[PDB]
Task: structure prediction
Amino acid sequence: EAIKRGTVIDHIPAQIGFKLLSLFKLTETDQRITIGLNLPSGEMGRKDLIKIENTFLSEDQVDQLALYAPQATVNRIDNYEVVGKSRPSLPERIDNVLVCPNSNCISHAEPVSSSFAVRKRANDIALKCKYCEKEFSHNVVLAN
Amino acid sequence: EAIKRGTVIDHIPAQIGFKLLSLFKLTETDQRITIGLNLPSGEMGRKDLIKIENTFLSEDQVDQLALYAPQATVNRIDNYEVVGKSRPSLPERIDNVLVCPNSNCISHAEPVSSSFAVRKRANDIALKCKYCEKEFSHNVVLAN
Amino acid sequence: ANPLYQKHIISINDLSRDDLNLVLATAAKLKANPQPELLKHKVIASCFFEASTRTRLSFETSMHRLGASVVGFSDSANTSLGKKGETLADTISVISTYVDAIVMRHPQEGAARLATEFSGNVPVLNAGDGSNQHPTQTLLDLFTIQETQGRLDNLHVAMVGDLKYGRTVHSLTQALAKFDGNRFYFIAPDALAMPQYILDMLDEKGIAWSLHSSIEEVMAEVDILYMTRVQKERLDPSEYANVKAQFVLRASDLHNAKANMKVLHPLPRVDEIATDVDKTPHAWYFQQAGNGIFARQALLALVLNRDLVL
Amino acid sequence: ANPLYQKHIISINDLSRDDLNLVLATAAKLKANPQPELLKHKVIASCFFEASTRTRLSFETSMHRLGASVVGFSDSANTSLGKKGETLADTISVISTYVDAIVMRHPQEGAARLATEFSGNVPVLNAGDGSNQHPTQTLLDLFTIQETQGRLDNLHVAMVGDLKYGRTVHSLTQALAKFDGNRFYFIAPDALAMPQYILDMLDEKGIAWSLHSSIEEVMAEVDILYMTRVQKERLDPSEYANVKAQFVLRASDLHNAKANMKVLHPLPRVDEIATDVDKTPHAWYFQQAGNGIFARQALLALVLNRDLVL
Amino acid sequence: ANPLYQKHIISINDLSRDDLNLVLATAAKLKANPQPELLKHKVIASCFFEASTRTRLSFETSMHRLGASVVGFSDSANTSLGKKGETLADTISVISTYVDAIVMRHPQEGAARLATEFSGNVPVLNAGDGSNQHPTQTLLDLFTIQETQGRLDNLHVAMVGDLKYGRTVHSLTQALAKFDGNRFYFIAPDALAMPQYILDMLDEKGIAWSLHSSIEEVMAEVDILYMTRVQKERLDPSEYANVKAQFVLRASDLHNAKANMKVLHPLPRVDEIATDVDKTPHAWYFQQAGNGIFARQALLALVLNRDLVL
Amino acid sequence: ANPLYQKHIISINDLSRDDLNLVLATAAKLKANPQPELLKHKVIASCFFEASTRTRLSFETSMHRLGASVVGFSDSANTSLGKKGETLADTISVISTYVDAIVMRHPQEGAARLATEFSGNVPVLNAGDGSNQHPTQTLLDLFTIQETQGRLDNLHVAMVGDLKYGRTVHSLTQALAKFDGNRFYFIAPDALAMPQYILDMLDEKGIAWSLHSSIEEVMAEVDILYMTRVQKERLDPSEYANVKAQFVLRASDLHNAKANMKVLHPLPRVDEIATDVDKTPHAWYFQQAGNGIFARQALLALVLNRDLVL
Ligand SMILES: Nc1ccn([C@H]2C[C@H](O)[C@@H](COP(=O)(O)OP(=O)(O)OP(=O)(O)O)O2)c(=O)n1
Ligand SMILES: Nc1ccn([C@H]2C[C@H](O)[C@@H](COP(=O)(O)OP(=O)(O)OP(=O)(O)O)O2)c(=O)n1
Ligand SMILES: [Zn+2]
Ligand SMILES: [Zn+2]
Result:
């Protein structure tokens, strides 16, 4: 089960596990990798979890998990045993992973990384494109 | 950790488990999944491993891995016992997963699934699109 | 002779409940018992001043299924001598000396009506005039509702999409309002709401209607879910993306739908009906299109024959 | 019922030798004994998403010679609602509720094949899909060879011109390779050579072929001289002039030609066949074109009738 | 250097109030004392990916008034037959090796911002990017309001017309909202109302605004009447007819206007402003256009010239 | 006067090695010490009979960098509805009474040469004539190779892509073949091989060249990797798919490249060079484009200014 060093992120919701591996390139390394999926934890829909060997993620790297997996916990391993628990906060910039829903936005088919700004509302979250400067519900952005 | 009833895909070429999970949407289920990439590989140099419970792969589904892990080993398990091992063999047809390299093929942006006839050649595999009837090296098709 | 013999077919507002029922009963009869020689030796003008391939093929097929001959044109950005100079009035005055009926589609509102004033005794059938009328679409819609529901009264009808600019939904609402006990559910963004004059018309007849922001609110009760395209051409792309999700339909949405419920759509349907709806028993937009043939046959037959032995 | 009843006609690769012979025997019968009412009351869609006047007129004439009615369109750089947005799949799903068969030509490879997946029980006939197939051209070519030579086996067939990009010659070579003892002569500049996959296919069947740089090398032995246009559009004008002379045919070149030898060309033929060839008894490209009518009639008849009394 | 030296000018939301004041003060100076050689030996690209004759001439005139040389183009022609398959990124990467500054207008939102990521040390000035920003229009508007009213604070500003889709009024509102005590009156049909996000921005800032059905409701207290074109291509022609009167201005409407009031319009005004307004002392749209030169000079001067203007 | 004073610049085959060296040395000088008034009071015609935004802006920028004024046009629009029935001869006869030099690009080969016969004492600079010459492209290429490699002799030069139809690689090969000890590697699919006449020219000069199927075969010994666009409009899309990989470059392909190696490309590179190449020290296509300015200045300066540049 356990790894000597690297990182383990836990308490990932069901069906969000694979999406993290996808979006965040979370498995793109010659270093060792072990993942568990649809794992039993506590609730009926339960949990996914990931473990990564010999690699560490910055505090900023943690924060990107917020939009999909708010309730997680990232965990550093240095010998066998843990060091510190970590929690993702809403970042100020979500870059690279989202796609602007504005079909006329210059960002499409150009060599730039997507970039959005975040702010809360009743019933949803507004995301604002760096390029077109248009603002959308996350529920609009997260469906394309 | 080991499994009671289901399927184990072993000797997966390293860094490929994730891909297999993507292409074949293996994570689109509720059954418990266990994965390892570049793992403790006595029986290899660098290999991947995927476990899926309460689910079984037919002969054709197993054969669909032939192009991505032609030396994998698919294990069928019940009551903790491995009841069958099979190796992927070259399928005669590959559907859904590949994309036709011909940019003028009708298949792009039409509501149909890709489909290719497969035939082995000395040094490669030839793939012939059901729609445009053009034939390409698997290296060309797999490129994108 | 039948009430529609030699009548012009211009506006849903000119057709009574009885007229509608007569077209539909005739359509059912020709569907069951084709009369491929009814209009033998008739010549019909297919005049698409505005091109519409789907509507034109449908109408011309109807003509041929009754044995009629067809002459016509479909016009893009052009004309020969001497329209763009020659009036529509003169064009109809000429063509009406040639043919037995004129089917026409035109970019300006009122074009078919003006045509009737110059076509002498040649009946004009309106295949669409600008943002005004499209009565044979409404007839095929109504035929499809009647055929699948067994009736045109006491229905729950939801309309979803661009209700402000869809001449097809205005017309269908007017038509359905000629029958009793129908209830309407309008699902549209505020910028594309069903117009007040439609709402006033329903109010004056004591017909119930309500607004809903989601298909889920009405799915359990709806008999007909009529989807209409979004005229995104008038809209900012950003705006079109912010309210896309409100009229997108997919197979999962039909989970609590009544067994009888049908999804209609005058087409094309990109971005509104996911292809996964197509295989469900509720998807009926292709069947709807196929019904255009029988509705349009009935209309041609009624208009060009005194009495129909069916 | 006959082996082709209600079958789609998409690719030469899907037609057996027996299928080919059946189409040709039927074509000979209709040529000798026309059946102008065979397809009475059938409606056929002539759908030229890609315009081709010669092919469309030929096909539509065939339809009328069997008594069928015809609806359709020819498309330039356009479309009405709502293709360029509406999928081909939806277009076929609609049109197949109207008509008894669909003849279609399209700029993308595979278009006809995709159509069969949406047309239900309505047969699709491929009038050409991009650089892929054009099976009714190949059928009319084969009918012409059989009619003039009395057979499709043991022939000497030369092909001259742009062999690399001519879908018509690829298809004819595949078709002729289903028969026995044929020998091929390929006459083309190196830049436009018959593709290796064609050559491999002939090798695998033990079919003899050879390259020649001039028509003179083969004239004494050739039964069929099949000329194909040069797609000069892909070429530098200087390049097109340097190798023009190698595929130009004139009357003097036919001096030692066999009495039976015919010159074929799917047309148009500018710059390849001098007009002085036209009057020789070997010129048969217009007769070839006229044969399109009988080949296409046979196909429509076989596909739309269970059993043909001829 | 001055605060704007070598800065990109992309969006009004990136310019502080001090920035705006600096541009306007610089504009006032150049109007009063021209500096025809300030940018001698600079070469500026006038890149109109989207054509706009009025805006381009204004900008290129401003370049020449400071002695700069100009190279450029105007497309809108290249569209989708290929337009330019080359990325904007590459176009900018190339052009930024040629010139000292890039002025660009583009049909896609974000285009100028994208340019800055590829222009190296070459400043980019946004002449309009889709429905997003148009800051030099806002700068000449502000300069015109400041000149005629003596201030940018404590004004009564009415905006009329298509408030929904006008990038120019969105931007002017944001800009005026950076100053204090301004009150807005929004006059627009419901289909064309000032968007919620603008209203919300005003609410956070505690800025007063009100909705009005017509111009006469507020004519007696406005300092600036800023009219906009109604993009009638968005509306139904009958819909346009019915709301037209509320956003059209004629001279008799001006009876109770303050002596200091000016009517602005970014042009063309063809529909909204009658020509009898032209000779009132309130008509200031042509003087407005004229100030584009001084605002655009100020911006070029500030961005390309290290030391502040005297 | 300098050797190039008042000379026409039409073809690389008319420029000696000393001419090439003189242009490059002049270009180096102007890059190092600009002379913004050298051509003050000259007026130069920028005549783009065939449109080319990148080449035109480069040329017009170079004119302004020396202080010259520019008049001009860009057609490609006028074609065959009339284009201009006037002869090129007459157009030049007229224009050569207006201006001090003519820079021209034309779709027909020989056009610039023809111009010189009608331009009187007005020099003509060829900005590209059909598939013939493009000497200022070759001059900026050479300048870029000399700058980054320190020499034009004893280099390892790889050319990749459409070697058959690229006027730019034909011309660069001829140019490099005027210097000593250069070795070429030609990487192209068979349908797009370097033409025989180029290979024959190299053979007479005893210059080494070899054919290679891919870039990796020679990546470790090349000093210049000169990539070209594959005119995919010539190939079948499936053919393009199958050979694509051999003429596309990405960053990982560069692992064993010499430290001094530069990747050049006359642009656009949309297909052949991945964007991850851009930030390697080998990417030099944008710097290449930038050198167009200095090469084009040098040429204008040499041709219009009697005394050599200091
Ligand atoms: N070499 C190691 C050492 C530890 N772990 C991890 C796996 C478990 O996720 C974690 C267990 O410790 P926790 O603090 O996460 O257990 P909790 O206290 O969080 O459980 P609970 O939240 O239910 O109280 O240790 C690991 O993967 N590899
Ligand atoms: N209840 C079980 C039994 C087996 N396995 C896994 C472990 C191995 O990765 C694979 C094969 O099981 P084996 O007992 O056959 O292990 P082998 O060592 O024999 O595999 P191989 O035949 O390749 O040597 O399946 C499992 O996950 N759960
Ligand atoms: Zn955006
Ligand atoms: Zn294909």
